[PDB]
TrEMBL record, chain A:
SMART domains: WD40. Keywords: Cell cycle, Cell division, Centromere, Chromosome, Chromosome partition, Kinetochore, Mitosis, mRNA transport, Nuclear pore complex, Nucleus, Protein transport, Repeat, Translocation, Transport, WD repeat. This is Nucleoporin Nup37. Component of the Nup107-160 subcomplex of the nuclear pore complex (NPC). The Nup107-160 subcomplex includes NUP160, NUP133, NUP107, NUP98, NUP85, NUP43, NUP37, SEH1 and SEC13. PANTHER family: NUCLEOPORIN NUP37, NUCLEOPORIN NUP37 P37 -RELATED. InterPro entries: NUP37 (IPR037626), WD40/YVTN_repeat-like_dom_sf (IPR015943), WD40_repeat_CS (IPR019775), WD40_repeat_dom_sf (IPR036322), WD40_rpt (IPR001680). GO terms for biological process: cell division; chromosome segregation; mRNA transport; protein transport. WD repeats lie at residues 115-157. Component of the Nup107-160 subcomplex of the nuclear pore complex (NPC). The Nup107-160 subcomplex is required for the assembly of a functional NPC. The Nup107-160 subcomplex is also required for normal kinetochore microtubule attachment, mitotic progression and chromosome segregation. It comes from the Eukaryota.
Automatic annotation (TrEMBL), chain B:
This is Nuclear pore complex protein Nup155. Essential component of nuclear pore complex. Could be essessential for embryogenesis. Nucleoporins may be involved both in binding and translocating proteins during nucleocytoplasmic transport. The chain holds residues 1158 to 1388 of 1388 of the full protein. It is found in: Nucleus membrane; Nucleus, Nuclear pore complex. Belongs to the non-repetitive/WGA-negative nucleoporin family.
Amino acid sequence: ASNATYTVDCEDYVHVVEFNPFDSGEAGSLLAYGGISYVVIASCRFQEEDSTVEGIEFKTLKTFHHGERVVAIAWSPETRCDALLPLLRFATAAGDKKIRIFTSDFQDKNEYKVIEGHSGYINDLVFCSPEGTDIASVGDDHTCRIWDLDGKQIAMFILRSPGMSVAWHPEGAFKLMVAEKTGTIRFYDLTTHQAILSLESVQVPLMSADWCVRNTLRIGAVAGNDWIIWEMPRSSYPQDNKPAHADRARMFRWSKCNENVFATTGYPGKMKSQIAIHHLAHPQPILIGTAPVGSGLSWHRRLPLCVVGGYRKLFFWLTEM
Amino acid sequence: LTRQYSHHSTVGDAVSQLDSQLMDITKMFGQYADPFRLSECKLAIIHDPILVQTLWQDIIDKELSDSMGNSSVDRMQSLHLKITSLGKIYASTPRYFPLEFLVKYLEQQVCNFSWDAGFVTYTMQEINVPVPKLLEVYDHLFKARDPWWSRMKKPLHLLESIYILLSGYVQEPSKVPSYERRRFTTLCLDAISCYLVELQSMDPAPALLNTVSNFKSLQAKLERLS
Amino acid sequence: QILRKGSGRVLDLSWEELRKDVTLTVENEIQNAVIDYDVSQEEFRQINIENWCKFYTCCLQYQETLSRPLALLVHPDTNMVCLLRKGFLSFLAPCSLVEHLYLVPAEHLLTVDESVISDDIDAASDIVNLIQCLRMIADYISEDMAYLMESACCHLQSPERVAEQILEDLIANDIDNIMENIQNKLQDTRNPIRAIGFLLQNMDLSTLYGSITASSVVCQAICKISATRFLICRDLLILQHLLLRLGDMALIGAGQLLHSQQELIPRAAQLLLSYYMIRWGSQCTSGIQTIVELFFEDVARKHFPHVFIQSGASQLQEPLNWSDLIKRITNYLLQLLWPSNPNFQFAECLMRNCQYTQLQEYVRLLLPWCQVNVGSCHFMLAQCYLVAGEGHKALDCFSQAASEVEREDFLEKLIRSPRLQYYNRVLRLLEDVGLPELVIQLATIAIGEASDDWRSQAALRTRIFKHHLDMGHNNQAYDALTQIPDPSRQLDCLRQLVVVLCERSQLQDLVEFPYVNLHNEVVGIIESRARAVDLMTHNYYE
Amino acid sequence: VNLERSYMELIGAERETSRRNFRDLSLRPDVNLVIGGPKYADCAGGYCYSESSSLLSATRNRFLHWTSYADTLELVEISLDINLVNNAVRLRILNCSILPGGVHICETPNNIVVLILTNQTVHRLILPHPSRMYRSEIISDSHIQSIFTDIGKTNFHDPSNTYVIPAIPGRAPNTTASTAWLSSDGEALFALPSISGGILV
């Protein structure tokens, strides 16, 4: 088990962690993490980006009182730290089945809006517009729902099982990916409000799916114990299927810098949650990390670096390319 | 394996062919590998581990039906002797003897047939497995928290087996070379302190109170021996 | 076989294998039909439809050929009737009276012997006229409207509001004056409500027949009965809302008003919701089995020797009658499936089985309208959430299930204060999953329930101490240790704290921590280890 | 009298992905392939055992069915009580088209006798009666054999069991009418339309 390259202390348990995938106009990479009753927004700078930094410079920028356990965080594309018009916008899902949109100027103006209408737990959410006006959410009510920033439901797709992950297509307009617990991944067009296509996993339950940003034909997921890769439009069947974890895989995320590298996490388990970093050319994980109990997995935008939340700590692994 | 496969008959042809002429290595390996288990002989001739462990378990099973048809204690003794002789055959090789798979699997059989708790400790000491190495295996198996022991309604019986190992050791100290005894007694006091903390975290009962009393008495005797 | 153009020996493919095999075969034909790299999305969709259509029409032509009619087998002594078709065997089973009347053609419905429906000729005639109105609705329901009702059941929408919307659309589109014809036949019905109540009431050896064919035939009988009776219940609800809007053909009436409102609303609520729940339950081993066939084989069938004995068949000399026995088995199975039995088993079996999803959906569809096994449903749902990693929702569901703990055998078997016993069980579960933070939170709640039992409080506080120590929360572990009421356990926890902090080299915290009269216990422990250990020093002496 | 007026069709779904491992048996009678012979329509039939209604009988809820098309007879034993092992046989009578209604089953105290008429041949099959197969009340259910289990041991080429219909007085062409039975003395009899308009026995 590799030790984490960097470790940052947190006030409480980290339930979710997400790097800002967008350019905020700052030299540092923005990071959001959700606790039991709060969301923290921080800036991270690494020695690999700036030779004036020894290891990791971690600065808390803002803390938002949430009052509920945060389960998912989505960054808005409008998020900017530019000194002329700073705007922080992100969405959260929590155990109360509500979405909260937070807006801040990083000064005194801190607003949040509550969106209601899911009848079950929300499992995942994303901003599903380049303009950052629309939010997609999925949950245990067997719905995928589309919301404006006004909290009005624009659209609703009835699922055949609980929606487990949702992702916007990185290049193609109007394409939403929805991963269902029974192994089906569906693609929806938000203009026509129609399902375009599905993929099926060989294993169940399907727990997380992500798009490869560097190769928009590739989808990766975790189902049962295994990680699964599809290459579109070649087949509805997996191209690759290999073991990820000895007992239940939970999260899958593609590296933002390398189309052959991805991370998986094991389920919040008695054997301390393993992070496994995989490279498609290798039959085994290139790195196996241990986090004592960790939830959330996110990749840095530029560096070959991933973060996992744990017990009062963030753990960072740099992958040698 | 003769005695194993209902006295294996083919083992007679195999032993006569092995006596009638000298055999070449390849022929020997293939034939005997597939035919009867012989990982200790394979190790000796050369001089998948999981597959070898599975084959050893299958060989033990054979002994087990032969003995199904015998006295509960007679069957036990038969298996003891067979295992002992064949382990002495592969004693110097650890790849031809799953040290961990074997202890786990035999303790599952002790639970299934419900035998004595001293059995495995006594058998491994008679093979000349060092008491420190045997304690390391038991401590590892206990710390592994295998759900199997709880499913069999007998984790306290597992810890009683551990107690029996350690008691045998106390009572016959020459079983550990004179040059390790101090370090080993300290290791026992540390281990017992951990076991007493875990036992005091569980619910109270007569049998538990007797086991706590036994370990406190043993701690006080080890402190006098240190 | 024909699409592949290939002489491959068809392996006895499993059905999942056959599905993958169809998919890959049609995808390959689509990829071959896409000649240009720049196909518009519309042209690609059109090509996809054309290729699947072509495969489907091919399956149809073979199914037509296998479906070709053979002959009849009638057993002289047992009266068993079989329809021999070209591809399969069908059995003819007697139809129940309600299904007979709904399904018979309108021309033959006029020649039914009213004496068989009821000893009461007028009740028999009213049932006949009602069934004719249900059919005039059934004949004008579009597929969009039938789907809108089935969608409403699946999405747990109110079937009543949806029956009303369907009725508005039927009236907006009444080109043939059908509403006038239904109105005219309803005027010929003397007591439509008694006829409605009769319909609703009639709709409300273990080794033998253990085969998969018998299991499928029996469970298909259940599916068709439940589907037919779901439509009858939908059309009956729309008709009941029309009868309410037409009933205003009069003043409400006080006596009629009070009596009708209480009686009808209670009966109706105890009616449409129950029918919807039964339909949802019906909708919910090298052979393909349905979840109902699985439940029948594993649970329901084991109870049939009791159903057979309770019926007064204490004479082992009565011959087996097929008609009586199938009707009894199917009614008893409907009660078990119908969420009206305390069995508490299909959901538990799903929780202990690899499948969980289907069990969540089964409980979702059942819980709003079925009041039988509600605690057992919450227990099953809690297991599904625990396996899904949603431990807080699991705890809420386990807490709801605890209330049916009164007169409960399954929870009594675990025991052979009740809330503290339940929390001790959930604590063992959270320990085995390896979630120490939640174990601390739950053990802190369980100390509140432990009120006067200092032994349970000592055990729970020792457990909190252990998990804080294992997590490295040294201050919180020390605080938990000071709260232990048992001095013996407190000393053993103190020994564990001193050892773990020394091994972790966290010597500063250990210095800060204010031991009471036990400063010399530490020196005695370290001295006992020091002298006991070898000359090679570490940091005990230091 | 519950006047059970209507019935409903219940599909006994053969959901076994095992096609009932049809013990394919091919009979080659000494007869030539008639090119352009009458195409008979596909037909089916069934037979119920004596004492099948008796709760202590070994024949309880047991019956036979068959389908015949062209040169092929598919025979099946079904029990509603127990899954029978080896309960399906596909008999192919090469070059002979099975007559519509040409299959007859007769029961005796010791045996089940299957009598088969084709366009050109008559056949007799002798199977053990279910009551003679089992001498011990202690049989585990998972191993109850069909009467067809030992069908591959019957000598079908025995002249006691197969006969070729002579051309004169012979059978009338394009007729489907036939019947077969056992006499009191255990003899097998087959009746068909003669070319002369009489009955050939």
